[PDB]
A paper describes a structure:
Diatoms rely on fucoxanthin chlorophyll a/c-binding proteins (FCPs) for their great success in oceans, which have a great diversity in their pigment, protein compositions, and subunit organizations. The light-harvesting antennas of the diatom PSII belong to the LHC family, but they bind Chl a/c instead of Chl a/b, and a large amount of fucoxanthin (Fx) instead of β-carotene (BCR), to harvest blue-green light; hence, they are called FCPs (fucoxanthin Chl a/c binding proteins). Lhcf proteins are the major antennas for PSII, whereas Lhcr proteins are mainly connected to PSI, and Lhcx proteins are considered to be mainly involved in photoprotection, as some of the Lhcx proteins have been found to function similarly to the LHCSR proteins in green algae. We report a unique structure of photosystem II (PSII)–FCPII supercomplex from Thalassiosira pseudonana at 2.68-Å resolution by cryo–electron microscopy.
The interactions within the Tp-Lhcf6-Lhcf11 heterodimer are similar to those in the Tp-Lhcf7 homodimer, such as interactions between the coupled helices C and Chls a406. Furthermore, LHG520 of Tp-Lhcf11 and LHG512 of Tp-Lhcf6 are inserted into the interface between the two monomers and strengthen their associations. Tp-Lhcf6 in the heterodimer has a longer AC-loop and a shorter C terminus than Tp-Lhcf11, which is unsuitable to interact with Tp-Lhca2. The long N terminus of Tp-Lhca2 and the AC-loop of Tp-Lhcf11 form tight, hydrophobic interactions at the stromal surface. In addition, a pair of hydrogen bond between Arg150 of Tp-Lhcf11 and Pro59 of Tp-Lhca2 and a large number of pigments and lipids contribute to the stable binding between Tp-Lhca2 and Tp-Lhcf11. (B) The long C terminus of Lhca2 extends to the PSII core and interacts with CP43, PsbW, D1, PsbQ, and PsbO at the luminal surface region. Tp-Lhcf5 was associated at the outside of Tp-Lhca2 loosely by its N- and C-terminal loops and has no direct interactions with Tp-Lhcf6. Both Tp-Lhcf5 and Tp-Lhcf6 are in the periphery of the supercomplex and rich in Fx; thus, they may harvest more green light. Owing to tight interactions between Tp-Lhcf11 and Tp-Lhca2, more efficient EET pathways are formed by Chl a410 of Tp-Lhcf11 to Chl a614 of Tp-Lhca2 (5.7 Å) and Chl a413 of Tp-Lhcf11 to Chl a612 of Tp-Lhca2 (8.8 Å). The shifted Chl a605 and extra Chl a613 of Tp-Lhca2 may receive energy from Chl a401 and Chl a402 of Tp-Lhcf5 at distances of around 8.0 Å; thus, energy captured by Lhcf5 is eventually transferred through Lhca2 to the PSII core.
Residue numbers in the entry:
A (entry chain 3): 31 to 250
B (entry chain 4): 33 to 195
C (entry chain 6): 32 to 199
D (entry chain 5): 33 to 192
The structure:
Amino acid sequence: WNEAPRALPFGSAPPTLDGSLVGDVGFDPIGFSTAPFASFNNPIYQEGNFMTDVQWLREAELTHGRIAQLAVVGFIWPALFGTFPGNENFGGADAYSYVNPLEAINHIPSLAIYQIVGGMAWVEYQRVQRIKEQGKDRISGDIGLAYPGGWNPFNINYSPEEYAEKQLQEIKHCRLAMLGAFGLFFQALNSGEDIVSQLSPAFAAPEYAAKAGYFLPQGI
Amino acid sequence: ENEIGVLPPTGFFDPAGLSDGISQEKFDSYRLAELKHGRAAMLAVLGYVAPETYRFGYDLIPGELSTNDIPNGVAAIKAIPFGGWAQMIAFVGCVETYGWFTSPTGVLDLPDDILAKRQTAELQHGRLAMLAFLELIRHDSQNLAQPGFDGLDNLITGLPFLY
Amino acid sequence: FENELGAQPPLGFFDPLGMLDEAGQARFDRLRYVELKHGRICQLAFLGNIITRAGIHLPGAISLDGTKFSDIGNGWAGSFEVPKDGALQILFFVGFLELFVMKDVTGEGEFVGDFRNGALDFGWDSFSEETKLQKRAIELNNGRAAMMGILGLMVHEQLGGELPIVGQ
Amino acid sequence: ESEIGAQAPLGFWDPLGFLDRADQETFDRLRYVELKHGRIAQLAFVGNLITRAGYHLPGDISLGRAFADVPNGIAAINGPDAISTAALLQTLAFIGFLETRVMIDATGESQFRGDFRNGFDFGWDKQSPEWQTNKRAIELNQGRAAMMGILGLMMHEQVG
Ligand code: CLA
Ligand code: CLA
Ligand code: CLA
Ligand code: CLA
């Protein structure tokens, strides 16, 4: 094992991290990268045509991170910008009026849940197809969003260095957003309130501590 | 004689001479017991604290006997029906006798020195957890047999921020 | 076996349990035959169940002693009011269909499940080479979907609840 | 594969074709499972009959409950008015300890998987040519019959 890697400068990192994958600093004290995580019971495994273990872990990291990135804004938005203009002529019985994120899950029509689940299933069926058909040449991410060659309504083009910089930004935001989403969820659970109704009271003053006011007459 | 698990706090700690001569197979069997007992103790200490705040909300018997209701500690073995214990022990035996629900990707391939250090650490943490379990059940049974005895209140005397 | 039909693009060849591994040819034929039989049965059962739940019932569905068609319920519990002898007659008819008619009674075996009685063709050589494969696929897959759907309907009927779309 | 187990009107009886591929180890494992299930089944059948007759051990099982107080049948282990869970757990532990420390092969008698001589036997030595075969066809056979019988008893006592 290599010794003294950036991050954990008094520790060690496995030899499998190397360079390659963007975002690599050497943070891997336990392992998880020297084990066949993409070969044991994988039903879509293809001998001599699949990806490596660390790339599989990167795929998992990207998935968890993108979900968390969406989830943070999902937690914050309805409480601060107001609810969706929906619920009109829907007979929802103020379903969308609720702003506590842990309460809205018990008041939405089942059609919304099933639509979300179906959309996710479709997206990742496409992802599975791409993974199988791309062989042992995996560009990571895939799913064909806005890059030349795939779907690209805005026709985004980037120089290779710009593409690498975008990849680095994406991975950093993914990690930070995972931490933030975890924190927001458990804060809201323990406090029993959304983030805005928990932070706004602690902005100016408590009611029992503020002074009565100014009553001194003027002109005397 | 001299194997993994010897640390400077003591030097051999074999007062009763339970090893003496024996044989290699007997010592290997002893070590395998020391590990299994230690891992079980670690898991038990960890799982004696978790139900104090969380509790999966499923029904052991459909209709009654929700996990939200059964008491925590040594009073659970009386509440849970015998069939549940039988099924759990059967599942553990399925895990142990066969290789089911076990994956060979957790063994890892660490270098020799890292492996030795981690094995010693595993043994030490297990050995601490065994005595932890001893105090835990001592206090629980003493308080349950006659309330008020051992005037400290609540399960888990340490970590008072739970209550 | 990794190239036969049923390897739809979405997932490709899919054998998680890996029961095929080493096999001859009777095993694959038997598996395909039973899969196709289950698919056809489930398609018919699902269509019947959905049309009965839709609300339209046969005016001629009445049985002995009147037993107006509107009295008959739906579901496994809702099927416990038909006369015993009528159900025995239905079972005897289906068993007869399994003993005769529903087999290859000519000796032509272009593929498993191509009974056709060698006499009731509705136009087969008209289709192109690829159209045969497409129709055999579109069939099998809809059979698989019907199998899963009817199992879900039967399970949730006894479990108790409110499935979307369908009232329940 | 024609060995002990195919006789009595119907010969090799494998309607579902489990042994279409077959192996020596697979057949040995299946035979051992069948034999163990059969032995346990006949012992349980005898025990259920004898406790149905009315006989009971003297004394008390738990703290203040005689052996003759517990119900007869399934209700003994599960349901209201059953044996205390502690006693059942300890009896199960005793059964497990005896199973894992008593009836294993610690000497090397081998022969058939399921032989637990360990040097202790009565007559399985002097006799040799064929009494082994017909006796084994009995041991297993009776096991099958008693297995069906105990299953039927459980069915009846659950539905009756
Ligand atoms: C602490 C007690 C203890 C211990 C350690 C053992 C240990 C062992 N027993 Mg054992 N046994 C015990 C008590 C014990 N027994 C008791 C009290 C009985 C009843 C008298 C049995 C009856 C028994 C049988 C019949 C067999 C064993 C076997 C075994 C061995 C493997 C067990 C295994 O793989 O896990 C169990 C793993 C499982 C996955 C369990 C499968 C459960 C099946 C599939 C379901 C059975 C139906 C269910 C019980 C009821 C369904 C209800 C219905 C409404 C659905 C092992 C040496 C087996 C053996 O020797 O292997 C060749 C074997 O065949 N035992
Ligand atoms: C279950 C089967 C199924 C399948 C395979 C599909 C498949 C499809 N639907 Mg669809 N749909 C379904 C059920 C299904 N649907 C149901 C039940 C409804 C309600 C009646 C709809 C309503 C619907 C509409 C209205 C539309 C589609 C569309 C589409 C197409 C594009 C989907 C897409 O990109 O969304 C992508 C969706 C997302 C990326 C959302 C993901 C959001 C987060 C990140 C997922 C997080 C999931 C979370 C972890 C789950 C836990 C939370 C939960 C407890 C709430 C695709 C062919 C669209 C189309 O063009 O088709 C014509 C379209 O406009 N569907
Ligand atoms: C000695 C171990 C032990 C024993 C005997 C019990 C026994 C019991 N626990 Mg418990 N528990 C344990 C450890 C243990 N637990 C641990 C380590 C945790 C922390 C996760 C918990 C958390 C916990 C909760 C939150 C609850 C219980 C409850 C219960 C009771 C109901 C049975 C049940 O659902 O258990 C469930 C038992 C477990 C979940 C333990 C699983 C441990 C195995 C070894 C995990 C194996 C790996 C796992 C499948 C995932 C793989 C990860 C991968 C990295 C390998 C029962 C008395 C319930 C109750 O009513 O309390 C009174 C309840 O609500 N337990
Ligand atoms: C499809 C599989 C299946 C089925 C049909 C069942 C069925 C049942 N489970 Mg169950 N279970 C399963 C899988 C399954 N389980 C799995 C995978 C787990 C996780 C390990 C559990 C964990 C579990 C728990 C924790 C409990 C149940 C209980 C029950 C019973 C519900 C209450 C009842 O009917 O009281 C009638 C109950 C009886 C008449 C007593 C049944 C005695 C059992 C079946 C004997 C088991 C013997 C064992 C498997 C083999 C011998 C021991 C082995 C060590 C050698 C019911 C018989 C509850 C229960 O037993 O309530 C009493 C309960 O508390 N189950």
